[model samples]
Target chain A: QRNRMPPPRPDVGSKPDSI
Target chain B: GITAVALYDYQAAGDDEISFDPDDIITNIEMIDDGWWRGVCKGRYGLFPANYVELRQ
Candidate 1:
């Protein structure tokens, strides 16, 4: 599992947005 | 945040390490919480998260 995924935030990026 | 902890107190200790561990590869990593050791006790162990830099954003 990708546990490092950051929490949902508008400044960072949307959850659907892939890094 | 408290500023010290042991390896056994990390959420990703047994996990892999990558160049992208510190900074987000292509995304602006979110600052879940300010300070060096924020969520170690509850997340992993009483060990301070600062001892495990990878836990912070």
Candidate 2:
């Protein structure tokens, strides 16, 4: 038998370093 | 399950502040990118500096 896994959630929001 | 505890008291310096008390428990934390985590604390949800809290397994 095989099991299926859902994809991970996407990261949201902005980072301070990127500013 | 993953959890985190605040290392110090952070006051909201601006209107977008996600302030927390010292040793406050942060839950449902998600990595939003480098050095920042989004989570909920005491019914408030927002992003905070990852360096401000320590992760617990």
Best by lDDT: 2
Off by over 4 Å in 2: A1-19, B13-17
Pairs of colliding residues, candidate 2: none
lDDT of 1 by residue, B23-47 (tens): 2212222234342222333233221
| True-vs-predicted CA distance for residue B22, candidate 2, Å | 1.7
Residue B13 lDDT in model 1? 35
Tens digits of per-residue lDDT for model 2, B6-57: 6766654445437777677888666564555567777777766555665666
Which lDDT value does model 1 have at B25?
A: 19
Instruction: Please report, as a residue range, the 10-residue window in candidate 1 chain B with the lowest summed lDDT.
Output: B17-26
Question: Cα lDDT for residue B32, model 1?
Answer: 40
> Interface RMSD of every candidate?
8.9, 11.8
Per-structure clash totals for the candidates: 0, 0
